[PDB]
Ligand binder design. Sequence first.
Ligand SMILES: Nc1nc2c(ncn2[C@@H]2O[C@H](COP(=O)(O)OP(=O)(O)O)[C@@H](O)[C@H]2O)c(=O)[nH]1
Ligand SMILES: Nc1nc2c(ncn2[C@@H]2O[C@H](COP(=O)(O)OP(=O)(O)O)[C@@H](O)[C@H]2O)c(=O)[nH]1
Ligand SMILES: *P(=O)(O)OC[C@H]1O[C@@H](n2cnc3c(N)ncnc32)[C@H](O)[C@@H]1O
Ligand SMILES: *P(=O)(O)OC[C@H]1O[C@@H](n2cnc3c(N)ncnc32)[C@H](O)[C@@H]1O
Ligand SMILES: [Mg+2]
Ligand SMILES: [Mg+2]
Lengths: 177, 176, 299, 296
Amino acid sequence: TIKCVVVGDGAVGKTCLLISYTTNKFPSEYVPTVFDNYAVTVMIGGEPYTLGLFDTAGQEDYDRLRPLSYPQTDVFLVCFSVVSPSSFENVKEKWVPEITHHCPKTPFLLVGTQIDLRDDPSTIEKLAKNKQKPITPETAEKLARDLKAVKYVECSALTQKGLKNVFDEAILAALEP
Amino acid sequence: TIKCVVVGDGAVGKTCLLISYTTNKFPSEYVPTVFDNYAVTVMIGGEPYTLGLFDTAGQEDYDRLRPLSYPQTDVFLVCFSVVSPSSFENVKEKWVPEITHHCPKTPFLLVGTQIDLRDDPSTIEKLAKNKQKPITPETAEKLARDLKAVKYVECSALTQKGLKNVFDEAILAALE
Amino acid sequence: VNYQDLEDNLNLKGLISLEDDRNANFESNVLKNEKFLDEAREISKKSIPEATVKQMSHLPEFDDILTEGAKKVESRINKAITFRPSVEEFSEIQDLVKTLPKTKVIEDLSTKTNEITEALAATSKTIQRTPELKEQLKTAIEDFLQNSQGKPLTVQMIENLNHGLRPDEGEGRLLYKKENLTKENAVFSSPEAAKIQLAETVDFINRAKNEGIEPSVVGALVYQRLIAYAPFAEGNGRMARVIVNKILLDAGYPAFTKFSDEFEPQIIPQTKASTKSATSSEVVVEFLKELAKKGSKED
Amino acid sequence: VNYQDLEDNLNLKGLISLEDDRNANFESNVLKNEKFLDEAREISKKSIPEATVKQMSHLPEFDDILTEGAKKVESRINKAITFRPSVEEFSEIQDLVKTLPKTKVIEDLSTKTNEITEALAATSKTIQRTPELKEQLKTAIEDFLQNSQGKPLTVQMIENLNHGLRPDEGEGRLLYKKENLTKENAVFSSPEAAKIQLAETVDFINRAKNEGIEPSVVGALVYQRLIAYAPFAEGNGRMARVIVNKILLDAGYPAFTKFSDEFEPQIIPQTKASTKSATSSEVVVEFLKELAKKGS
Ligand SMILES: Nc1nc2c(ncn2[C@@H]2O[C@H](COP(=O)(O)OP(=O)(O)O)[C@@H](O)[C@H]2O)c(=O)[nH]1
Ligand SMILES: Nc1nc2c(ncn2[C@@H]2O[C@H](COP(=O)(O)OP(=O)(O)O)[C@@H](O)[C@H]2O)c(=O)[nH]1
Ligand SMILES: *P(=O)(O)OC[C@H]1O[C@@H](n2cnc3c(N)ncnc32)[C@H](O)[C@@H]1O
Ligand SMILES: *P(=O)(O)OC[C@H]1O[C@@H](n2cnc3c(N)ncnc32)[C@H](O)[C@@H]1O
Ligand SMILES: [Mg+2]
Ligand SMILES: [Mg+2]
C-alpha cells in the first residue's frame, strides 16, 4: 500500500476529487465531510500499485486530531482552490509547515483544484469585485519550488481534467529516495 | 480479487477463524457476530494473490438476507465443527444445497473447524454421554467427494494449526 | 440583555425564556451525551493507525482529542441558531410582524396542501418540469397535514413526511444520514446530534404553540435549525419548508420559500472562510422581511 | 393464561401486567423504530456488492429482506426475557420467596459496597488475585450506590457505573458497543435495540419499586434482560450484577453471583443449536433457588 493523504482548507474540494477519481463520477448531491479511506489499484508502466487514499478535515477545529492520521504516510496532496486565494495562502502559512513538522522526509504535491471555475464568468467577476483573481499556473509552480514540492499539478473534479495525472504523480513521488 | 465467502452453522467458529487468520491472534474476548469483509495478500509460488474474505450469519433468521452477498463469489468455505455432528449434517442438508442454488458453478471447500477440541476432556465426555462422536477426517473426506467439494481441509482457530493452509487451498480452488 | 420593560404582544419573552433553558442544557444534552461522544470517538479513530491509537490510549487527554472537533462544530451551530436578540431587534421584530400579510379566513386542507406544494415548486426547476414528482410530493404534504392536524407534532410524523418527500429514491435507503454529510460549503450537525435536537425542535414547536408564541417567529427559527441539523440522508430542505409552512399557513400567513442566494449561506455555518455569518435574530428579521414581500409586486 | 384468582402476595399480577404492556408495545418501540431499522439496513448492505444493491433497490421486497433477520433476533430475545409464568411457576415463586434469607434491618451503604464487591470477586479469579483492580471496582460500586440512593435510577448512572467497572481499559474507548458482538455462543441485542431496551429496563426498575413488586423477582428479571441486551462494549456482566444486587440488598436479600455453568447459557438465546433454552419464569425460579442457598 502507498499511503496518500489529502490535506488543505475546507471547501477546496478534497472530498469531491477523491470521489470523482475513485468512482469516475463527480458527486452532485450530498458528500461526506471526510471520505472513508479507500484503496484502489493503479497501473504505472505495466506495474500494479495499491494506492491508499485518506481524506482529512482541514478546519482549525481538527488541528490536534488530524495529524494522528499522518503516521506512515508515503505522499501528501496539499490542495488549494485556484479560485480561492486564501486557500492558496494557507498552503504556505499552515499546510506545508504542518506536514513537514510531522513528516519532514515525506514527499508532497501541490494540487490546484476546481480549475473549471477559472472559466466561470460569475466566479471571476466575484473575485474581481473583491480585487482578487484566480491563481495562475505560473505563481503556483513558483510556490511549489519555493516550498520544495515534488511538483505542481492541477485538476477539476467536475470535468475530471488532470484528475488521473494527479494520482499518477502522487504514486511516482512516493516511489523515491 | 479472489472473493472467499465463509458459511456454516452458528458457533462453528466462522468469525474466529477469519480473525485468527488475519491478525495471527485468536480473539479471547468479544467478537463480531459477522466479521467485516477484509482483503489480504496471500503468496503462492512467489506470486501475490488478493483474497477478499467475507463472513456470514449462519442462523436461520438470516436465510433471506445471506445469499445477497453471494454474487461474484469465487470460492466458498463450508464450515462445520469437528465436534458438532449437527453442524456436519447441515453441510449436506443446508449449506451445499444453499450455495449450489444461490451461487451455481462456484467451487467450495469443506472445512472442519475447532480440531483442538477433539482432545478436550469436557467436549469428548459430553459427546460420548450423548452416544455421539467427533467427525473423523475420513468421513469428512467422503462427504466432500460425495458433495463434489474441491477437497476437505480442517483447522483450529485457537492453535492456528492448519489455518494458513485452508486459505491456501481456497485460492487454488478458485484458480483451478 | 433585559427585555422586561419592552413592548411585547408576540410572547417573544416566553420564547426567549424557552431558548435560554435549551441553550443552558445544551452542553449536558448534546456535548456530554455519550452516544454523541461514542459517535465522535468512532469517527475520529477510523483514520488513526492501529499502533498510534494504542500509544495514545495511555494519554489522559486522548478522549478530548477524539471529541473536541465534533463538539466545536455542534457548539458553532447552536450559537448560530440560538435566539437572543438585542433590544433593537426585539422591537423591530414586534413592528415587522404587524406588516405580515395575514388572512382570517381559515383555509382547508387541500388549499393548504396546494399552497405548500406550489411553494416547494417555486424554487425547484425539477418539480416544475416533472408533474409525477410534484403530484407525489403533494400527496406526502397532504398526508402530513392530515396526520398532524389538531395534534402535537411527533418525530414519527416527521420521519413519515421526510420519506414521503423522497419518492425517486428506490428501496432499502436509510432514512437518517449515517455520516457527516455536506454540500455547497454547508456545515450540518452530526447524525446523533441532529437526532437529539430534532426531538428538541419538536418539543419546541409544540411548546411554542401552547404558550401562544408568534408563529411567524416560530417558523423562522424552525426553518433555520431544522436545516442546520439536517438529520435525514435526503430531503431535509423540503421537510423543513413543509413543517415551517404548516406553522405559517395555520396562522394565516403566506408560504415561505427560500432566502436570497446571497443571504441563505449566512444562516448556517460554512466550510468557506469568506462566507459571512448571520445571527439567529438577524435570520428572523430577514425571514420576516421575505415573508412580508410574498404578495408584493416583486412577489 | 389468566392469573386473576391466584394466591399472590408478591404483586406478581402487577408485574405481569407491566410485562404485557411492554410486550404489546415491543414491535412499535423496537421492531418499527426507524433508528433500529436504519442500523439493520446499514449492517446488511455492508456485505452486499454495490451493483447488487442497485438492482435490489428496484424490488419491493428489498427493505424487508434487509431488516428481517435483525428483527427476528430481537423478537427471539424478547420472547426469552418476557415474564409470563405458568400457574405452577407462579405458585412456586410464591413458595420460594418465603424461603429467602432476608434481614429486617437494611445494611448501610458501606456494608452494601463491600457485599457487592465480594459478590463480584466470588466468580472472578482475576479480581481475587488483583487487589488494585478489586479496589477500583469497589470505588465504582460505592459511587454508584451513592448517586442512585433514594433517587430514580437513570441511564446516566448506569453509564457512569459501566465505565467505573472498566478500569484497566485505556483512554478513548467506546462506552456502548458499535456492532453486533458475541462470545461463548451468546446472542445479544443489536446496539440500538440494546439502548432502547436499557431505557425500558431502567423505567421497569423504577416502576416495579413504586408498585412494591417483589424485589427478588425484579432482581431476577433485570439480571436476565440486562445481560441479554448487553448495551455496552464491555463490563455488561459486572454492571448487571451490581444493579441487581442493589435491588436485592435494598430489600434485605443476600447478593447474587452467577447461575451454574450448566444453566447460565440457557438464560439467553445461543448461536449453538444444542444448548437448552429456559423461559423467563424458569430463569426466575432458578434465580430464587440459587438465592435461597446463600446463607449456607
Ligand atoms: N466547480 C467545481 N466545484 C467543485 C470541484 N470540486 C469540489 N467542488 C465543490 O466544492 C464544494 C465543496 O467540496 P468538498 O469536496 O466537500 O470540499 P472539501 O471540504 O475540501 O472536502 C462542493 O459544493 C463541491 O461541489 C470542482 O472541481 N469544480
Ligand atoms: N477451542 C476452540 N474454540 C473455538 C475455535 N473457533 C471458535 N471457537 C469458539 O467458538 C465460539 C463461537 O465462535 P464464532 O467464531 O463466533 O462462531 P460463528 O458463530 O460461526 O462465527 C467462541 O466462543 C470461540 O471461542 C477453535 O478453533 N478452537
Ligand atoms: P438536503 O438536500 O436534504 O437539503 C437541502 C437544503 O439544505 C439547505 N442548504 C444547502 N446548502 C446550504 C448552504 N451552503 N447554506 C445554507 N443552507 C444550505 C437549503 O435549505 C437546501 O434546500
Ligand atoms: P460482557 O463481558 O460485557 O459480559 C459478560 C457477561 O455476559 C454473560 N454471558 C456471556 N456469555 C454468555 C452465554 N453464552 N450465555 C449466557 N450468558 C452469557 C455472563 O453473564 C457474563 O458475565
Ligand atoms: Mg471534505
Ligand atoms: Mg460469526
